[PDB]
């Protein structure tokens, strides 16, 4: 846990962020669970230390992530969504997040394009770890289709109503093609 990195991230501080966000899960999973990211790790969190929820700032951006997961599973979104998934609409209110949506902000914490697109997660994971360590509520990140939000240790760190499930619908192939569109 790098002293310089923690120092630099603290200096950036947080912004309070509100947006209607989107997440997809298996149809049986809780819309606000983050244990999956904890068990395996994600681009913006090391495994085993804290739950993390990944959200997108639009249904379209979320569908891009569906496609990317399908690709990693060696198939297409349409075929993957033959298994039961659901699309969750989750309102986020006044979440105190580290804003890494600009290249300048990313450069300030030592991240560059290879870090956000490439196979090596170590940089983004260290940054997510430090943000969680400083009790930030999450990290605003670039997402292939727009803005991504990584919510770290939701249950502990957030006040009543900061995350609110607004809607859940079956994410069928049809819904995907509709939402994916330009």
């Amino acid at each position: 846990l790098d002293e310089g990195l923690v120092q630099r991230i603290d200096a950036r501080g947080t912004i309070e962020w509100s947006e209607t966000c989107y997440r997809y899960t298996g149809a049986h999973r809780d819309a606000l669970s983050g244990e999956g990211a904890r068990r395996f790790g994600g681009r913006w969190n090391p495994p085993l230390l804290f739950p993390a929820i990944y959200l997108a700032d639009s249904a379209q951006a979320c569908m891009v992530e569906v496609e990317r997961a399908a690709q990693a599973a060696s198939t297409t979104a349409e075929k993957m969504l033959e298994a039961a998934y659901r699309l969750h609409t989750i309102d986020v209110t006044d979440l105190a997040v580290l804003d890494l949506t600009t290249p300048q902000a990313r450069e300030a914490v030592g991240l560059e394009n290879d870090d956000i697109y490439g196979d090596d997660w170590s940089g983004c994971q260290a940054v997510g770890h430090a943000a969680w360590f400083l009790h930030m509520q999450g990290v605003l990140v670039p997402a292939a289709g727009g803005v991504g939000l990584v919510v770290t240790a939701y249950e502990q760190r957030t006040r009543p109503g900061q995350l609110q499930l607004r809607q859940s619908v079956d994410l069928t192939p049809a819904l995907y093609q509709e939402l994916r569109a330009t």
Binding site: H28, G36, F40, T75, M80
Partner: protein
Amino acid sequence: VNVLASTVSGAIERLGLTYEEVGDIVDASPRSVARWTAGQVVPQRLNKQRLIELAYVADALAEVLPRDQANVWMFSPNRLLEHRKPADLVRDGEYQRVLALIDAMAEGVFV
């Protein structure tokens, strides 16, 4: 047929693995796998713990992919597993990592 064997057999069948495929994962002959899953006596080499672990993975994987794609997934180099096949991880005792990935897939973790 004993219920342990038929339960394991059911999990693998829903993935559509062949006895040859299962055999390569649990270090047994295809015939030994066929006999074991049919609840018959198997004096030969067969790693029961690996068969159960394979069953765990097969059942878990059905939550996130349909049968065809689940089957192919087992034998496809996965960039999330350092370009290794999930079937090989199971074979070599790393089923827990495979189960972790499946749970990430089920939670829509951005990859």
